């Protein structure tokens, strides 16, 4: 996976759209904020469904639209604050460091 | 002729039902409605009722096939789905007989085989065992026994091991209750479970009810907003009132333990509540050697 | 056959009563609110026609907030 | 606020003396009252205030 | 055991001297009859049956 | 040509099955089909449960001969004389036995120590074996002694009169081989690796969470020799002592429930627990304490010699020319854990591919350090 | 007439409402009678997160208590004794006698 960083899509967004045509596989674009839910079950179920959906459609490109929730780790591994954002953050990692793709999933992070 | 007749209805599928009201005068009552639109519930039942488990209520006049005085307002009866008459009486208690009640009829532990635990043993033996036997001494004094004990200190010290050794020794039944187990998804369920636990205890006499937790049965919050966690509170309160409601039984002995070091959730002011205090003593080098 | 809908009971308490009751006691001194309710409730029922003539509709719903005690 | 996730962002003016005159007129067509009234005066009586 | 079972009902209203509204629990709402051995004095408005 | 053959295949199977269903139809029958994914020469006659599904329940007992045990919302009906033979093991229900609730009903098979219904990941044997060893070297040596050795040679431990631990703890960054190590032993040790994600166990409604913990342990007991891999237990692992403040209680209940099962009456068995934490500090003293957690296996800053072994692993795939030596560069390079050491190498192959060369070069290596030094610091 | 609060709460629809009501009804026929409520905290809870999880039952019971008062019923010779551990969940209609 790669990370594209800049003041919101003036060429980040442009480049992604362009790349999906080139690459000739299924493009799936996910809005990352939308994974956040203030409901105990909902948020984790969604990230695990997101991974499930990838696997069927493989090879596939994952475009992850920016989140607030990848900004916070602190020095705890979970906190009495908003628990869910880190609970979710962890499962993103577990999926990644559990299974490496050469091409089954390609990740664009933004 | 009568004997064959009754027998056929017994072979299953069969309806067991629960008698809600004993009574044997003022018939008629009501169940179910019509429809259209706007929603408010209603239910009734009188004379004698049995509510069968399709959720249907039935009016029967009594028979001598089983006696109604021997029956109660809250009893399980075996019913002949023909005329809807009570063929027989079934045992006591309804619904769950606790969803996970562990009975240990004889524990495998003995405290005569472990020394160096000694200080704690001396206090324990003196607390529980002495009222039952030594009763004659108590009777002459005119003071009554305890009913509950508290043990507090760092977990995992083999505090529990000594509790299992006393149970083995004494000839009570040991009943293990775990505090998150009383908690359910289901609404109001736990209080029934505890009431039942108490009731089963009454029949078994003597008994030790061992309550793990004073954290999942030792919170109740003193927070202003606490309403959502009402379930937890209702159960805890239920135990405390079940103790306060009547005047003690010498059929139950209760021992309570913590699982996280020290909270405040008042449950120790009377002796129908807890009153005995066992402390874990900090490690003595001499004691460690003895264990080794 | 057709039959009209009928029922009138509840055990959550829903009454249609042929007996009116009470009066305002020491709970009274409603006057300012009294005047506003007099205009709202009583006139459209008593006189539908007056409201239609001017061309302005009556109310359909009214809200009361405050403790019932 | 990032441009091009924007197109037009349009102002809505706070109400005014000219404006008030004609809303009053619309409303009046719903109900019956006397003819021979000067409404012009009535809008003026109003300070600023919402539609 | 030969004897018939007794269903619980409440009367909504009395339609005709032969017809009654009952909301029973063998099935749903019904229009039902009543024995011609039974008193008129027992017809009372809103009772358990 | 193929088609004729396929039609003949349906038809032959159909005639034999029609006769069998006509026959099975009489006297009724259990839950509704056969699925094979074992062998037919090993067939059980104990089936898992925690509730009793009944469909008929034909049996032999004197007080009645077709006794039933339910608890279901509609038909919770039970035995007419308590504790009289009912289910016929798992006849006409496939999990008929006894209800957890109880109504003083017969138990040929228990409502606990069963796999029952689950939501589980069980992951058959991996393929990996040594892939970041060098500074992961210590971690390997100890893990074999704890997990493998008791299963290989149990009879030895008994003579001595020693019993081995039940859990070990893993810490440091994941995907550095902290993670690999648990799969690498799982493949060697030949015992089922059961992966539970603690975060998943977390539920929207109370009591469910405890239920899950319990279910896991019943399955664990049945199978004897298994590994429970807990992925980053800190969600329902410790942080926490505060005793609630609004659903910090619900997660705490799960944490406490696990303790009960561990410290409890159960014993270890052949069951092994691998725990995964970030920094172990987070976790509570109860989780740390002996009589469940004893050995904590660590990661470390890898010595220079170590780095070389990892590079050595990589150099079999990667076309090289060996006349230069990576160790000299490696001393000069930042000291960093195993994952960065593989990554710089991986970066190196790309430069070649642009260069339009097929063999490694001294040149490639110089470039990699500048990017990598930048990447930690973002 | 003795009340144990957590037997009034049940996992069934409208039982708390049916039960309280009948109970109250029986007191008026039978009068005089004292209804002793021990540790109301199944009636104690004005919500804050404004759920209807279990919380709908809290609202169900509370509403019933007020409905009896709001009615044309008068506790004619009927006496009420309440027990509370900590007072903070009282309604604004209770301050008024």
From Swiss-Prot, chain A:
Q: Which residues form a coiled coil?
A: none
Binding residues annotated for ATP, in chain numbering: 6-13
Q: Where is this cross-link: Glycyl lysine isopeptide (Lys-Gly) (interchain with G-Cter in ubiquitin)?
A: 17
Entry-annotated residues carrying N6-acetyllysine: 38
Localized where? Cytoplasm; Nucleus; Membrane
Q: Which domain of life is it from?
A: Eukaryota
**Per its UniProt record, which disorder involves this protein?**
Birk-Aharoni syndrome: An autosomal recessive disorder characterized by failure to thrive, severe developmental delay, intellectual disability, spastic tetraplegia with central hypotonia, chorea, hearing loss, micropenis and undescended testes, as well as mild elevation of liver enzymes.
Q: What does this protein do?
A: Component of the 26S proteasome, a multiprotein complex involved in the ATP-dependent degradation of ubiquitinated proteins. This complex plays a key role in the maintenance of protein homeostasis by removing misfolded or damaged proteins, which could impair cellular functions, and by removing proteins whose functions are no longer required. Therefore, the proteasome participates in numerous cellular processes, including cell cycle progression, apoptosis, or DNA damage repair.
Q: How does it assemble?
A: Component of the 19S proteasome regulatory particle complex. The 26S proteasome consists of a 20S core particle (CP) and two 19S regulatory subunits (RP). The regulatory particle is made of a lid composed of 9 subunits, a base containing 6 ATPases including PSMC1 and few additional components. Interacts with SCA7. Interacts with NGLY1. Interacts with PAAF1.
The family line of this record is: Belongs to the AAA ATPase family.
Q: What is this protein called?
A: 26S proteasome regulatory subunit 4
Swiss-Prot record, chain B:
Originating species: Homo sapiens (Human)
Q: Record's family?
A: Belongs to the AAA ATPase family.
Q: What does this protein do?
A: Component of the 26S proteasome, a multiprotein complex involved in the ATP-dependent degradation of ubiquitinated proteins. This complex plays a key role in the maintenance of protein homeostasis by removing misfolded or damaged proteins, which could impair cellular functions, and by removing proteins whose functions are no longer required. Therefore, the proteasome participates in numerous cellular processes, including cell cycle progression, apoptosis, or DNA damage repair.
Keyword hit for Zinc: no
Instruction: Kindly state the subunit structure of this protein.
Output: Component of the 19S proteasome regulatory particle complex. The 26S proteasome consists of a 20S core particle (CP) and two 19S regulatory subunits (RP). The regulatory particle is made of a lid composed of 9 subunits, a base containing 6 ATPases including PSMC3 and few additional components. Interacts with PAAF1. (Microbial infection) Interacts with HIV-1 Tat.
Q: Share the record's PTM remark.
A: Sumoylated by UBE2I in response to MEKK1-mediated stimuli.
List of residues binding ATP = 153-160
Please give an example of a GO cellular component term from this record: ficolin-1-rich granule lumen
GO molecular-function terms, A-Z: ATP binding; ATP hydrolysis activity; identical protein binding; proteasome-activating activity
Q: What is this protein called?
A: 26S proteasome regulatory subunit 6A
Highest lineage ranks of the organism?
A: Eukaryota, Metazoa, Chordata, Craniata, Vertebrata
Q: Some GO term, biological process aspect, for this entry: which one? A: blastocyst development
Keyword presence, Membrane:
no
The main place the protein resides is cytoplasm
Compartments it resides in? Cytoplasm; Nucleus
From Swiss-Prot, chain C:
**Where is this gene product found?**
Cytoplasm; Nucleus
Q: Where are the transmembrane segments?
A: none
For this chain, the family text in UniProt reads:
Belongs to the AAA ATPase family.
Could you tell me what this protein does? Component of the 26S proteasome, a multiprotein complex involved in the ATP-dependent degradation of ubiquitinated proteins. This complex plays a key role in the maintenance of protein homeostasis by removing misfolded or damaged proteins, which could impair cellular functions, and by removing proteins whose functions are no longer required. Therefore, the proteasome participates in numerous cellular processes, including cell cycle progression, apoptosis, or DNA damage repair.
Q: How does it assemble?
A: Component of the 19S proteasome regulatory particle complex. The 26S proteasome consists of a 20S core particle (CP) and two 19S regulatory subunits (RP). The regulatory particle is made of a lid composed of 9 subunits, a base containing 6 ATPases including PSMC4 and few additional components. Interacts with NR1I3. Interacts with PAAF1. Interacts with TRIM5. Interacts with ZFAND1.
Domain of life assignment: Eukaryota
Signal sequence annotation: none
Q: State what protein this is by name.
A: 26S proteasome regulatory subunit 6B
Q: Which residues of the full protein are shown?
A: 141 to 209 of 418
| The species this protein was found in | Homo sapiens (Human)
Curated annotation (Swiss-Prot), chain G:
For this UniProt entry, what's an example GO CC term? inclusion body
Residues with the N6-acetyllysine modification: 11
Keyword list (alphabetical) reads: Acetylation, ATP-binding, Cytoplasm, Nucleotide-binding, Nucleus, Phosphoprotein, Proteasome
Q: Name one GO molecular function term.
A: protein-macromolecule adaptor activity
Please give the residue positions where the record annotates the modification Phosphoserine: 49
**Gene Ontology BP terms:** ERAD pathway; positive regulation of inclusion body assembly; positive regulation of proteasomal protein catabolic process; positive regulation of RNA polymerase II transcription preinitiation complex assembly; proteasome-mediated ubiquitin-dependent protein catabolic process
Specify the superkingdom: Eukaryota
- Its primary localisation, in coarse terms, equals cytoplasm
Location(s), subcellular: Cytoplasm; Nucleus
Keyword Acetylation in record: yes
**Does Kinase count among this protein's keywords?**
no
Q: What does this protein do?
A: Component of the 26S proteasome, a multiprotein complex involved in the ATP-dependent degradation of ubiquitinated proteins. This complex plays a key role in the maintenance of protein homeostasis by removing misfolded or damaged proteins, which could impair cellular functions, and by removing proteins whose functions are no longer required. Therefore, the proteasome participates in numerous cellular processes, including cell cycle progression, apoptosis, or DNA damage repair.
Q: Which family does it belong to?
A: Belongs to the AAA ATPase family.
Any idea what this protein is called? 26S proteasome regulatory subunit 10B
Look up and give the organism this protein is from. Homo sapiens (Human)
The range of the complete sequence contained here reads 196 to 292 of 389
């Amino acid at each position: 996976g790669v990370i594209l960083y800049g003041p919101p899509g003036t060429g980040k967004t442009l480049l992604a759209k362009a790349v999906a045509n080139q690459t000739s596989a299924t493009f799936l674009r996910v809005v990352g904020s939308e994974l956040i839910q203030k409901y105990l079950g909902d948020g984790p179920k969604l990230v695990r469904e997101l991974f499930r959906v990838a696997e069927e459609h493989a090879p596939s490109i994952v475009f992850i639209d920016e989140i607030d929730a990848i900004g916070t780790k602190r020095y705890d591994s979970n906190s009495g604050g908003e628990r869910e954002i880190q609970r979710t953050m962890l499962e993103l990692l577990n999926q990644l460091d559990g299974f490496d793709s050469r091409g089954d999933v390609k990740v664009i992070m933004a | 002729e009568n004997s064959e007749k009754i027998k056929v209805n017994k072979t299953l599928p069969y309806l067991v039902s629960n008698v809600i009201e004993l009574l044997d005068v003022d018939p008629n009552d009501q169940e179910e409605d019509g429809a259209n639109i706007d929603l408010d519930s209603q239910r009734k039942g009188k004379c004698a009722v049995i509510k069968t488990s399709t959720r249907q209520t039935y009016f029967l006049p009594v028979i001598g096939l089983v006696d109604a005085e021997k029956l109660k307002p809250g009893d399980l009866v075996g019913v002949n789905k023909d005329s809807y008459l009570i063929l027989e009486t079934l045992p006591t208690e309804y619904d769950s007989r606790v969803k996970a009640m562990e009975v240990d009829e004889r524990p495998t532990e003995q405290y005569s085989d472990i020394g160096g635990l000694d200080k704690q043993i001396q206090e324990l033996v003196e607390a529980i065992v002495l009222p039952m036997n030594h009763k004659e001494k108590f009777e002459n004094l005119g003071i009554q026994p305890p009913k509950g004990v508290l043990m507090y200190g760092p977990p995992g010290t083999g505090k529990t091991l000594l509790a299992r050794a006393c149970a083995a020794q004494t000839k009570a039944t040991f009943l293990k209750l775990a505090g998150p187990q009383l908690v359910q998804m289901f609404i109001g369920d736990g209080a029934k479970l505890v009431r039942d636990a108490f009731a089963l205890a009454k029949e078994k006499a003597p008994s030790i009810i061992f309550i793990d937790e004073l954290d999942a049965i030792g919170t109740k919050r003193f927070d202003s907003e606490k309403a959502g966690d009402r379930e937890v509170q209702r159960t805890m309160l239920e135990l405390l009132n079940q103790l306060d409601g009547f005047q003690p039984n010498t059929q139950v002995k209760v021992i309570a333990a913590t699982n996280r070091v020290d909270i405040l959730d008042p449950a120790l002011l009377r002796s129908g509540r807890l009153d005995r205090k066992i402390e874990f003593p900090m490690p003595n080098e001499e004691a460690r050697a003895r264990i080794m | 056959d057709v039959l009209p809908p009928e029922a009138d009971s509840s055990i959550m308490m829903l009454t249609s009563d042929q007996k009116p009751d009470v009066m305002y006691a020491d709970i009274g001194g409603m006057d300012i609110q009294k005047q506003e309710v007099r205009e709202a409730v009583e006139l459209p029922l008593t006189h539908f026609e007056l409201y239609k003539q001017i061309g302005i509709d009556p109310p359909r719903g009214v809200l009361m907030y405050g403790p019932p005690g | 606020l990032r441009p091009g996730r924007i197109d037009r962002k349009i102002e809505f003016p706070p109400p005014n003396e000219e404006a008030r005159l004609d809303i009053l007129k619309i409303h009046s067509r719903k109900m019956n009252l006397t003819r021979g009234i000067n409404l012009r005066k009535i809008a003026e009586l109003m300070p600023g205030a919402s539609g | 055991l030969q004897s018939v079972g007794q269903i619980v009902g409440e009367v909504l209203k009395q339609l005709t001297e032969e017809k009654f509204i009952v909301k029973a629990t063998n099935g749903p709402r019904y229009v039902v009859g009543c024995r011609r051995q039974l008193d008129k004095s027992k017809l009372k408005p809103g009772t358990r049956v | 040509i193929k088609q004729v053959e396929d039609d003949i295949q349906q038809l032959l199977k159909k005639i034999n099955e029609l006769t069998g269903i006509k026959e099975s139809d009489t006297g009724l029958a259990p839950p509704a089909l056969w699925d094979l994914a074992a062998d037919k020469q090993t067939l059980q006659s104990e089936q898992p449960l925690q509730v009793a599904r009944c469909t008929k329940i034909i049996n032999a007992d004197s007080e009645d001969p077709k006794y039933i045990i339910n608890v279901k919302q509609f038909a919770k009906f039970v035995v007419d004389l308590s504790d009289q033979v009912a289910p016929t093991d798992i006849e006409e229900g496939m999990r008929v036995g006894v209800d957890r609730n109880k109504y003083q009903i017969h138990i040929p098979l228990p409502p606990k120590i069963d796999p029952t219904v689950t939501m589980m990941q069980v992951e058959e044997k991996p393929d990996v074996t040594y892939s970041d060893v060098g500074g992961c070297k210590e971690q390997i040596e100890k893990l074999r002694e704890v997990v493998e050795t008791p299963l290989l040679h149990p009879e030895r431990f008994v003579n001595l009169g020693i019993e081995p631990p039940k859990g070990v703890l893993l810490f440091g960054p994941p995907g550095t081989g902290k993670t690999l190590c648990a799969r690498a032993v799982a493949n060697r040790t030949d015992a089922c690796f059961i992966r539970v994600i603690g975060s998943e166990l977390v539920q929207k409604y109370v009591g469910e969470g405890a239920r899950m913990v319990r279910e896991l342990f019943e399955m664990a007991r049945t199978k004897k020799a298994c590994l429970i891999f807990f992925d980053e237990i800190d969600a329902i692992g410790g942080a926490r002592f505060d005793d609630g403040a609004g659903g910090d209680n619900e997660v705490q209940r799960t944490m406490l429930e696990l303790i009960n099962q561990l410290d409890g009456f159960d014993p270890r068995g052949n069951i092994k627990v691998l725990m995964a934490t970030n920094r172990p500090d987070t976790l509570d003293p109860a989780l740390m304490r002996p009589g469940r957690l004893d050995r904590k296996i660590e990661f470390s800053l890898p010595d220079l010699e170590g780095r070389t072994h990892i590079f050595k692993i990589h150099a079999r795939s990667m076309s090289v020319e060996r006349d230069i030596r990576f160790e000299l560069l490696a001393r000069l390079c930042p000291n960093s854990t195993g994952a960065e050491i593989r990554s710089v190498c991986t970066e190196a192959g790309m430069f070649a591919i642009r260069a339009r060369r097929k063999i490694a070069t001294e040149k490639d290596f110089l470039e990699a350090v500048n990017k990598v030094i930048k990447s930690y610091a973002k | 007439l003795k009340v144990v609060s957590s037997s009034i709460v049940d996992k069934y629809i409208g039982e708390s409402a049916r039960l309280i009501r009948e109970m109250f009804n029986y007191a008026r026929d039978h009068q005089p009678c004292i209804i002793f409520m021990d540790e109301i905290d199944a009636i104690g809870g004005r919500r804050f997160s404004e759920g209807t999880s279990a919380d709908r039952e809290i609202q169900r019971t509370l509403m019933e208590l007020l409905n009896q008062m709001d009615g044309f019923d008068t506790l004619h010779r009927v006496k009420m004794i309440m027990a509370t551990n900590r007072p903070d969940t009282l309604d604004p209609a209770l301050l008024r006698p």
